[PDB]
Amino acid sequence: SPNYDKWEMERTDITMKHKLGEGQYGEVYEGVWKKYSLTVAVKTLKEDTMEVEEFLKEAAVLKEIKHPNLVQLLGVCTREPPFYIITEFMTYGNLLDYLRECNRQEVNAVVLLYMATQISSAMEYLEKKNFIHRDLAARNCLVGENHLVKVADFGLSRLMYGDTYTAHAGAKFPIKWTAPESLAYNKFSIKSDVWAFGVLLWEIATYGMSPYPGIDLSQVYELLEKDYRMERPEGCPEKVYELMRACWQWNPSDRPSFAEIHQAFETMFQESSISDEVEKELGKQGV
């Protein structure tokens, strides 16, 4: 028998403004209620979806992620005309959009440690929930007006394909942005997610430049396995880079957990800059 919760919401209540982009089961679009509300993202399954409603379980994962530093499920319409999942939308949009739009008035170093420490705390929680994001990226993070960043995914294979997307390599991620361990072994754990996060910290560092853009796709596996990293962005703190380097370590034993990562951000936020190293391969903005 189908079951629901406090998350049960009537579809008549939800008002749809415009389209954010596509998702896995179908498009994700921006909305709200009549008034006395805040901008929301609503994902749906297409009219041509089967009895395979496993979408409901994906909504249950959104229900599992409830935190102030995290995109949260506001509700689901299980009863009444077609099925909708309403999650919170953060006004700046996705992190590539936020950082690129902040060519106007750039995000400060203090905001970088803030936003990134929110994501590190987020995933620290998420690991204990036994949740593996796997696609954790700037596109898969959103920013509120207060400059706070939260973890999310619309299901967005073709949302903004021009700034990044890589050819659908069977699995649910852009292969050029994907980890060498994940390419070879085909396993994802918090360890693989920490690397993804390392590239994400770098997306935050470079202020929303395209990931792995200069270097070739077949070469991407080759260089990542070797020990390659993109060069440290200019007008970005070194401390995020010495940390993301730990995330970019090939060996899982060398690579840290999100508890250790929040600790790394903690010191940064507290009045600190370039520490000890940064002898070479740091200076200009990636490629």
UniProtKB/Swiss-Prot annotation:
> What does the UniProt PTM comment say about this protein?
DNA damage-induced activation of ABL1 requires the function of ATM and Ser-218 phosphorylation. Polyubiquitinated. Polyubiquitination of ABL1 leads to degradation.
UniProt motif Kinase activation loop: location: 153-177
Judging by the UniProt lineage, the source's domain of life is: Eukaryota
Write out the residues that bind ATP.
20-28, 43, 88-94
Q: In which tissues is it expressed?
A: Widely expressed.
Location(s), subcellular: Cytoplasm, Cytoskeleton; Nucleus; Mitochondrion
The protein's name in its UniProt record: Tyrosine-protein kinase ABL1
- What residues of the intact protein does this structure contain? 229 to 515 of 1130
